[PDB]
Each structure stands twice: as structure tokens, then as C-alpha cells.
Design an enzyme around this catalytic site. Structure first.
Site, PDB file in Angstrom:
ATOM      1  N   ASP A 194      -1.997  -4.012   9.887  1.00 33.35           N
ATOM      2  CA  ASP A 194      -0.976  -3.142   9.328  1.00 33.35           C
ATOM      3  C   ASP A 194      -1.148  -3.165   7.816  1.00 33.35           C
ATOM      4  OD1 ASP A 194       0.904  -5.301   8.140  1.00 33.35           O
ATOM      5  OD2 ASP A 194       0.340  -6.006  10.145  1.00 33.35           O
ATOM      6  N   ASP A 196       1.174  -2.926   4.140  1.00 29.55           N
ATOM      7  CA  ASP A 196       2.505  -3.118   3.588  1.00 29.55           C
ATOM      8  C   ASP A 196       2.553  -2.599   2.161  1.00 29.55           C
ATOM      9  OD1 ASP A 196       3.445  -4.828   5.855  1.00 29.55           O
ATOM     10  OD2 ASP A 196       1.799  -6.081   5.174  1.00 29.55           O
ATOM     11  N   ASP A 251       4.266  -0.433   6.724  1.00 27.93           N
ATOM     12  CA  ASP A 251       5.617  -0.821   6.349  1.00 27.93           C
ATOM     13  C   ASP A 251       5.878  -0.360   4.926  1.00 27.93           C
ATOM     14  OD1 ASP A 251       6.087  -2.020   8.810  1.00 27.93           O
ATOM     15  OD2 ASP A 251       5.359  -3.950   8.153  1.00 27.93           O
TER      16      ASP A 251
HETATM   17 MG   LIG Z   1       1.013  -7.021   6.908  1.00 28.23          MG
HETATM   18 NA    NA Z   2       3.592  -5.143   7.979  1.00 23.88          NA
END
Ligand SMILES: [Mg+2]
Ligand code: NA
Ligand code: NA
Length: 327
Positions: A194, A196, A251
Site C-alpha cells: 500500500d 501512505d 491511505d
Molecule cells: Mg503502508
Molecule cells: Na497504509
DNA sequence: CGGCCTACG
DNA sequence: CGTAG
DNA sequence: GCCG
């Protein structure tokens, strides 16, 4: 010699004891699957101690005195050193319970308690879950729909492309706002699962209402597959690729600039580093730390930080750059 | 004995 | 409950 | 599981 808290020692991304730490982290994960957060923490902490050592452990005597090594963690290392495998670790690895709990909890929207219920109901595969969709939240439906892509490593080229489109949307939503890459990529990782980002504006208060405006602008560019007043958005982006696209977890976090050093510290991690830092703050210094601030509960005041370095200094800790926070 | 990080969605 | 570091 |  080796400090007891992970926030008291540098932990680099590349280290010398990966075989040993990986075995202890299997036992930590399995402890979590059985609902023992305490045993999970000890095994995590023990693994992290080995990541901070300057050389390979080759003899059991090199563990004496190390924090978080007791009878159980030492026996695991002993067996690995003597035989190259630990029977307990191999038993866990091969068990239907461990394999299925790992499969289910890696789905976005599914944690241990949900996975455990499904396991007890006899479910074992992702297609089993798909065959019963009324038993899924919207978040879980999105996690399962995009599971293949979300299991593909996110590369630096993806991060750079995502940062560009997030910066474009943020600039359209609020001139002067900034976007900072955080998480594992800020700690120097070359791959991840992911991405961020932390968003702020230099004028306190101007960031109010920013995240819905950013999300609207990304959605109208066709970039959003999934998202949930708010300050954290757990998204799945439709990232363009040559001739096609892939889903990526992103995110997006907004913080007022007064909180930015605390949010940057918290969102840079690692997860274990931050738990240890918050434990240290409260238990050793009597101050309460989160991603918004550092609170003195006696004076009833918040520490005004201009940088991450300021926070470490206020806690009496030697500063560690992000690449040494890989606990 | 009993803690183990501390938030937001 | 889920999410995050 | 380890430790304050
Ligand atoms: Mg992360
Ligand atoms: Na994340
Ligand atoms: Na999950």
C-alpha cells in the site's frame, strides 16, 4: 547493551538475522490468530531485537542478556541454529488453521475475529467467501474483489505515479497544500502492499474539509475504486498502467500543520516502532503520545513540536531517521 | 499480578 | 468490528 | 511470553 525498547535503537531495513526473525514472526502471527496479543508482542519484540544486532547470531550464547529472550524464544533460535528448522514453527506453517487464518486476514476488511468465525463455520477458501456475499461488508466485498491486484507488490514507479495524481487533486482542492509520502516507502522500502500519504497546509485551519474535496476530485478523474467529515481515507485506486490498470491500496491522511510532526512520526512507523515509542512515552516519561500530539497529563498541556527531531528530544531519545525505524 | 499503543471509520 | 503506522 |  541492547536497549529494551525498539525506539531506543536503530533498526535498518537490511539486517543480518532474517531467518531467525522470520521464524519468531510466524509464532507472533500465530499467537495473534489465537487471540494472545501479549505473546504476539513478545515474539515481535524478540524478532526486532535480532534485526538490531550488528552481525549474524551463530551461537546460542550470543542471546544471553538480550531483552525479550526467555525460555521460549531462545529455544526457537537454538533449534534453528542446531538443525536449521524449529519443529514448532514448521507445525504452525503447515497447519490448516494457520494457512486459512493467514489467507482470510490478508483480505482488506477482515481481521482475526472475523476470520476465526469463518474458520469455525467451515470456510477455507476465497471462493467459499464469494459464494456467500450477504455475509460481507462493503469493505470486505471490495477487498475480495481486488484481492489479486492487492497481493501484487507496489513498486516505486507506482508510488511516483500515485503521488503525482494525489498532488494534482490536492492542488485543485486547496492551493498551497502539500503531500508527503509516509509509511514503509519513507523508511526506504522499495516495495510495499500500500502507499501512505500525509496532507497538510502551512496555514492552520485551511485544511478543514480538505479530504472530501480531494476524494471528489480523484473520483471524478476515475481514479477511485473504493473508499469509505473525515481525516483518514482508506482507498483503493484504479492506477493506470500501459494499456490497462491495477488496483492499489492508498491511505490519505489530513493533519493541521500544528500536528504535522506527530502525524508524520506516527505514519512513518514502523508499526512496532510506534507502539514501542508510545509505550516508552507513557511508561518511562509519563507523557501521552499519539498522531495528534504529546500530552503532559499533569500540566494539562501539549508539546509544541516543529519537527520529528523535537519529539524525540522531548522524550529524551536519540533521534533516529526513518530508515532506522524498521523495527 | 497484570500490562501489553492509541487513535479514526 | 474494521482500518492505520 | 516476557517483564515491571
Ligand atoms: Mg503502508
Ligand atoms: Na497504509
Ligand atoms: Na485484513
Amino acid at each position: 547493551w541492547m536497549p529494551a525498547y525498539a525506539c531506543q535503537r536503530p533498526t535498518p531495513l537490511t539486517h543480518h538475522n532474517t531467518g531467525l526473525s522470520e521464524a519468531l514472526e510466524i509464532l507472533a502471527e500465530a499467537a495473534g490468530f489465537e487471540g494472545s496479543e501479549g505473546r504476539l508482542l513478545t515474539f515481535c519484540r524478540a524478532a526486532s531485537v535480532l534485526k538490531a544486532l550488528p552481525s549474524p547470531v551463530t551461537t546460542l550464547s550470543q542471546l544471553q542478556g538480550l531483552p525479550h529472550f526467555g525460555e521460549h524464544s531462545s529455544r526457537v533460535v537454538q533449534e534453528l541454529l542446531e538443525h536449521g528448522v524449529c519443529e514448532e514453527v514448521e507445525r504452525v506453517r503447515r497447519s490448516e488453521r494457520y494457512q486459512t487464518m493467514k489467507l482470510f486476514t490478508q483480505i482488506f476488511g477482515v481481521g482475526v475475529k472475523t476470520a476465526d468465525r469463518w474458520y469455525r463455520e467451515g470456510l477455507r477458501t476465497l471462493d467459499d467467501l464469494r459464494e456467500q456475499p450477504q455475509k460481507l461488508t462493503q469493505q470486505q466485498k471490495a477487498g475480495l474483489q481486488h484481492h489479486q491486484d492487492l497481493s501484487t507488490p507496489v513498486l516505486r514507479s507506482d508510488v511516483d505515479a500515485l503521488q503525482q495524481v494525489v498532488e494534482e487533486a490536492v492542488g485543485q482542492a486547496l492551493p498551497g497544500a502539500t503531500v508527503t509520502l509516509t509509511g514503509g516507502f519513507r523508511r526506504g522500502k522499495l516495495q510495499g502492499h500500500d502507499v501512505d500519504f500525509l496532507i497538510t497546509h502551512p496555514k492552520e485551519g485551511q485544511e478543514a474539509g480538505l479530504l472530501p474535496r480531494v476524494m471528489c476530485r480523484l473520483q471524478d478523474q476515475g481514479l477511485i475504486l473504493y473508499h469509505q467529515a473525515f481525516e483518514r481515507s482508506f482507498c483503493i485506486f484504479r492506477l493506470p498502467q500501459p494499456g490497462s490498470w491495477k488496483a492499489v491500496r492508498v491511505d490519505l491522511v489530513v493533519a493541521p500543520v500544528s500536528q504535522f510532526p506527530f502525524a508524520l512520526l506516527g505514519w512513518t512507523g514502523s508499526k512496532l516502532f510506534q507502539r514501542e515509542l508510545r509505550r516508552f512515552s507513557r511508561k518511562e516519561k509519563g507523557l501521552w503520545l499519539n498522531s495528534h500530539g504529546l500530552f503532559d497529563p499533569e500540566q494539562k498541556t501539549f508539546f509544541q513540536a516543529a519537527s520529528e527531531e523535537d519529539i524525540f528530544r522531548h522524550l529524551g531519545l536519540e533521534y533516529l531517521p526513518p530508515e532506522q525505524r524498521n523495527a
